[PDB]
Structures are given as C-alpha cells and as structure tokens.
Design a protein around this ligand. Structure first.
Ligand code: A1AR3
Ligand code: A1AR3
Lengths: 306, 306
C-alpha cells in the first residue's frame, strides 16, 4: 500500500536530453534519431523577445549558429527547420539511445512525468497534470526551457510536453512536441495570464478510490445522488462536470472497492459542502485532483515498463 | 518557480535493477559490478517466513537455486553470501551499466528517491523521507522487495535503502545496502509495528522558506521567539526538537529570503497554534516535513547531475 505522486522511470528520456546553445541563449533539446527538438525562442535575443517574426529570425541563422552538446560530445547541425513553436535541428548523428516513442497531445486532466533539465542535464523528475486551463503547475527555473513531459507505456515513451515559459502566477505553459501550444499562450512577451481554472472532478473521485483501497474510509456514506444533482454541486465548487464516460472509466475502481461511482460522488459532495473537519485523506488535507483513474489503477496494481 | 516533491532522475539505477527468483519467491535485485544485492528473505518459503534461521537456510541453497534475470538476459550465479539481511549473489557478469556509487546510511529526516520495481522492471519513481521512527511512507505492492532508495550527487548514486516489508499501518521498513535494518524491525513475521513518529521540524522550516521563495508570505509575522521557547511549542505538537545546527543549516535560506530563522520559527509556532484558517502553502493545507534544506535549495536553484 501507500499512495505517492509517482513519475515514470526517466532513464529512456534522460539519454535524449541535450544542450542547445545559439547566441546568448542556452536551453534543453530533445534528441531523437537525427533531430533535436527545442523551443524556437532559442533563436531570439533579449530584444527580439518582445514581438518576434520567427520566420525572419530563422532565415538569418546558419547551421553553425546552433551549438548542440550531448553531454561532453558536440553534435554537428546539418539542417534546421521550424515546425510551429519548436525548432527541428537536424544533426549528423542519430541518437543511439533513441527509445521507441510517439508524439501525443494530451487532454486537460491527464497527467505526465516531467524531467526537468538545465544545460541538457537532467535535474529531477516529478508528476504533473495538464490543468483545465492548459497550464501546468510545474517546478521550473531559468534554463529549463526544452524540458519535456512524457508518459511511458510498456517500452514506448509518448512525449506530450515541451516546456516554454513561466506565466506571472508561477504556472507553466508549453507545447506538444509538434510545436503547438497548450492553451491560448504564445512564445512572445505579452501580458498573457493563465485564465480561470477548475478542479478535475474525475481525478478527485479516482483519488477517493485510491484512499478507500488504502484504508481511508471515514468519508464514505450511505447516501447517494444522481449524476445531475452531483453536477449542480460541482458547479458551485468550481469543479468541472462529471460525464457518463467519467463514470464508465471509474467502473474498475468502483468494482474493486464495491463503492458505486454515484455513491462516491455523494461522498465528494459532502466533502465539498462540509470540508474535512481536521481529518486527512492519503496524507492530504485537500481534495487531490492530479491522479487519473489510470494512475490509481497503476499504483494500486503494479504495472511496470520495459 | 513552483515546488514539487521531486525525485532524482532514475536512469542510472534503472540499469542496475534485476529480477531474482529462488523457489517460489521473486523479487528485485540490485546489480552492481559482479554482485546482485537483494533481501535475504528470498531464500524463505511461505512456512519458513515465521522464525527462520537464515544461516541454516542458506547452506541448503545451491548457486543454481538463484535465477537472476537482467531483462531478458539470464545471469549465471557463481557465488552467494549473506551480509546481515541482504544476500550478495556473485554473477559471472559485471553490470556494464554500473554507475559510480556508494553505500550510505541515511539519518531520519533525510530524503531519497525510490525506484519502485516489480520483477526487476522499474515501475515508478518518487521521493520519500526516512521518518523519525525509521519507517518510510512509500508506495509498495507485493513484488517490490528489493527496490532501492538513492540520492545522486553529480554522477554518483549513493544507495541508501533496500525495501523489505510493509508494516500493518501501511508504512515501509527496510535496510541500508549493508543489510542493516532501519529501525527496530526484523525480516521475520512478528507483530512488529512502526512505533510513534514525530514531524521533522527542520524540514517544515525549510519548506516554509520554499514557500517564501515562491511567493506565499501570508504566514510571516513581525514576531520572533527564542530557540528554547520554540522547542517548548514543538514538544506540544509532537515536533521534534530544533537544534542550533538546524538553525545553522537553515542560514542560506534565511539569507536568501531575509527572514531570520527564529522569525520563521515564530511563524511555525503561530501555524501550529492557530492552524492555517482555510489557506494553503505551496498548494498544501498541511505543514510539509519531507523536504530537507538541501531539497529546497536544490529546486529553488537548479543543481543537476551527470
Ligand atoms: C522565470 C523562470 C522560468 C521558469 C520556466 C521557464 N522559463 C523561465
Ligand atoms: C503487502 C504488500 C507489500 C508491500 C511492500 C513489500 N512487501 C509487500
């Protein structure tokens, strides 16, 4: 037992991380086969950074303007191209550590592991979720641009996130690996802000099941509710609607615990309307919404990855 | 910015994990150079498991009783020996992925990353602390025996933990890599229990600094207190004493935030005596004690590892 915000083993990604320097800017790149992926604002200098015309900036660049370091080994850039908000730097060396991978865009509410990096060098790994407002509450300092987020499914790394910027509330915004930003953010200096967020309702339910599986039952009740009546309480508490599909995805956990999903909704409703009254759940005094149904089944079962 | 329970990149450890089978028992081993380290209760069967005489059990074993799988590659056991509560299985193959390592025993209060494993196959990574009662609040299922805990310091993996058992409250007990258990636990089936715990006071302070660095300041105050007066409040709230050395280790964070350590103690005291009154700190509604001063400086700075 136990329940921890658990990331995927990061080894397969660590051997893809490289350092991309261009001008005065150094950031992290993702080296897969003979291409390094990185944020396109590497070609900007501090005064480009305002309202840049990236297609103009890139024609003025040479291959040799791109210093790529794979550890202490220099990579020779033989080509460069722009795909949305990422650069694709073509190197003369395929990454022999290239894992099986995909470029997948995730949904708000889904989680992923983040291998935070500085100067192409991995620093830590931690689990995040894509907030309903398409931000992520990460832990990122200057130099972490180009750190990626990923899931791993057996041996395949599904890359889903490239880090690009911090927003003024301290949350983080970036792209999928195809260079398309998550949410209404841009790689310029504007007064952009996160925008209002919600709590991921299906994930709180999944985490309530995680609790029941792990022995916290004080919040259960005989009561039940309809899906409609639950959703009127969710809207009050800035929770995002629960759909029948969410109830369906919660079936396995309902099944394993013997707690009908709508019964669990009744419990959440009471938790939302009454607070916790000085008690905790899985060592938390808040309702946790960054574990998916997948994550709960993953730790409460024992699935691994080769 | 941001603050996340952050583990070390796990790649260097993942390439040491192997599967040790012996009889009906399968668990994880740690392969470094030509030796696999694993818990000695692998040589037990379900009825040995009560009060075993492990030295008797091991003389009855043959080298060939030990199936060692490094992925899909079998390792030939050429020798076996017992060091306290671990087995040392000598294999004919040095692990070519052996990182620079040390075997270090940690102190209660210090943290480490845990690469949870099943059948020698890494499942997830997460950060833990050694509780004052020498347990750890991990996330471990059947088959996770032999998963290790570690820190990484530049390129060197300091291994500190081998997982051995779950205790009836769901917390976890194990050994250092020299086979010596953390705390008064034994690798038998007894009615052993965790024993009373405390909150790691120095770590809460470090995390309060993490908050101030990240913009949460609502809990600060003009007040101050003496170290003695603080420790009388700590004892009330089951916090463990703060020493001058703890204050000394907190200097850098005091220095960077401009908040004297004893001023921060005053804040903790008010937080202990008043609660949080519906507010949160670093997204937590509880006082967090599983970040050391090192961990805070590590994320709030940007140290990495090669
Ligand atoms: C302001 C620090 C920062 C954080 C993430 C990305 N870029 C910069
Ligand atoms: C009871 C499950 C378990 C957890 C950790 C280690 N061993 C067994």
């Amino acid at each position: 037992s136990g329940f921890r915000k658990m990331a995927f083993p990061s080894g397969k990604v660590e051997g893809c991380m490289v350092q991309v320097t261009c001008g005065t800017t150094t950031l992290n790149g993702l080296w897969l086969d003979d291409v390094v992926y990185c944020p396109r604002h590497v070609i900007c200098t501090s005064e480009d950074m305002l309202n840049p015309n990236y297609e103009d900036l890139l024609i003025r660049k040479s291959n040799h303007n791109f210093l790529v370091q794979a550890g202490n080994v220099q990579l020779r850039v033989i080509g460069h191209s722009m795909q949305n908000c990422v650069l694709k730097l073509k190197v003369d060396t395929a990454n022999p550590k290239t894992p099986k991978y995909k470029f997948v865009r995730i949904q708000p509410g889904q989680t992923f592991s983040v291998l935070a990096c500085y100067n192409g060098s991995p620093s830590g790994v931690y689990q995040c979720a894509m907030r309903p407002n398409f931000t992520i509450k990460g832990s990122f300092l200057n130099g972490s641009c180009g750190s990626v987020g990923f899931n791993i499914d057996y041996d395949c790394v599904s890359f889903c996130y490239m880090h690009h910027m911090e927003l003024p509330t301290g949350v983080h915004a970036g792209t999928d690996l195809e260079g398309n930003f998550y949410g209404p953010f841009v790689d310029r200096q504007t007064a952009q802000a996160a925008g209002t967020d919600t709590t991921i309702t299906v994930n709180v339910l999944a985490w309530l099941y995680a609790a029941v599986i792990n022995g916290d039952r004080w919040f259960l009740n005989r009561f039940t509710t309809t899906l409609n009546d639950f959703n009127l309480v969710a809207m009050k508490y800035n929770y995002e609607p629960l759909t029948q599909d969410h109830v369906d995805i919660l079936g396995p956990l309902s099944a394993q615990t013997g707690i009908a999903v709508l019964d669990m909704c009744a419990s959440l409703k009471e938790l939302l309307q009454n607070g916790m009254n000085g008690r905790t759940i899985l060592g938390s005094a808040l309702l946790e919404d960054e574990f998916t149904p997948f994550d709960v089944v993953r730790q409460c079962s024992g699935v691994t990855f080769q």
